[PDB]
Design a protein around this ligand. Structure first.
Ligand SMILES: NC(=O)c1ccc[n+]([C@@H]2O[C@H](COP(=O)(O)O)[C@@H](O)[C@H]2O)c1
Length: 321
């Protein structure tokens, strides 16, 4: 029937051609010359001539030549429970979250502080260094499939950057947040009203809408941003602490925020919360809060996580004006 090498060659070539189709048509940004693409396409068709078994309706060469890229928001499973975080709006609410941690975890706590972005939660699963799937939060177990749209974001790399320091992991799930910069938010709104479309009330809604598009070409045009702030199921990584895990993401080419600091005790946490209270509007995107998490992975595990929220993290949300 088909030889092992026959199938290997075909899948390899189909995948390469399929991907270039995505960049040229969907993202409108090809990474190879058109002439080269023509070479690849011919070879694919040649192979399909050679072997008619492989010719299928889903093949790049036959029945999806023009365009077969759509997003149907199919439910997809998250590798790890991705739960929403508990919120803390007062210093007093802080306090319980502060002491309780010290009761269970003890004195070797070391809380990580990160700015809280107000956009849409996005989960990426980056198997063998390739982006296999992007999905929304949903109910925490399963979410909608917006992989195609996630591939168009400038900030989201398709492939991980290999290096000796941080070897590319096997199966890697990295959570993050998609958002718009204030300037771009206004810009997109202007473009929208220019073409008769209704503008968005805020950047959160604007980003959510721009991501949730049935046709990913639409999302490719908008300047969505991304910042990775969490790790889901990871294989072959074993990052000791959360902050150390961030170096890994950095080495792999993933977007990370530059306003993350480590606070040894509650007092350090309070400073950051206070500081970002006066300076949070200086940032180019919407920051509604400060996120505090126990940095040590091993310690985190002990504290565990409740039915719908982690016990090792809490988000301080600044009061609305
Ligand atoms: N630069 C790329 O990655 C890439 C990918 C797919 C198609 N293409 C070009 O798209 C064009 C579509 O028009 P034709 O149907 O006349 O080929 C082709 O000429 C092909 O070279 C370019």
């Amino acid at each position: 029937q088909t030889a092992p090498e026959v199938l290997r060659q075909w899948q390899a070539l189909a995948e390469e051609v399929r991907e270039h189709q995505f960049r040229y048509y969907v993202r409108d940004a090809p990474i190879i010359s058109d002439a080269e693409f023509d070479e690849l396409l011919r070879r694919l068709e040649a192979l399909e001539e050679q072997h008619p078994e492989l010719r299928t309706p889903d093949s790049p060469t036959q029945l999806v030549g023009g365009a077969g890229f759509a997003t149907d928001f199919e439910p997809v499973d998250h590798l790890e429970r991705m739960l929403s975080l508990d919120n803390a709006f007062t210093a007093d609410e802080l306090a319980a979250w502060a002491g309780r941690i010290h009761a269970e975890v003890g004195d070797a706590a070391h809380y990580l502080c990160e700015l809280a972005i107000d956009g849409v939660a996005l989960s990426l699963v980056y198997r063998e260094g390739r982006l296999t799937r992007a999905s929304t939060r949903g109910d925490g177990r399963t979410g909608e499939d917006v992989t195609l749209n996630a591939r168009t974001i400038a900030d989201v790399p398709e492939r991980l950057t290999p290096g000796d320091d941080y070897p590319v992991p096997e199966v890697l799930e990295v959570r993050g947040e998609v958002f718009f910069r204030l300037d771009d938010f206004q810009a997109l709104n202007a473009s929208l009203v220019e073409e008769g479309k209704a503008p968005f009330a805020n950047p959160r809604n604007s980003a959510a809408g721009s991501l949730r598009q049935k046709d990913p070409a639409v999302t490719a045009r908008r300047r969505l941003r991304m910042i990775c702030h969490g790790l889901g199921h990871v294989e072959g990584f074993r990052p000791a602490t959360l902050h150390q895990a961030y170096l890994a993401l950095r080495a792999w080419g993933l977007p990370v925020s530059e306003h993350t600091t480590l606070a040894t005790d509650l007092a350090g946490v309070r400073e950051r919360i206070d500081y970002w209270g006066e300076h949070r509007h200086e940032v180019d995107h919407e920051i509604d809060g400060v996120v505090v998490k126990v940095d040590e992975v091993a310690l985190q595990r002990r504290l565990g996580s409740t039915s719908r929220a982690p016990r090792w993290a809490i988000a301080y949300k600044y009061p609305p004006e």
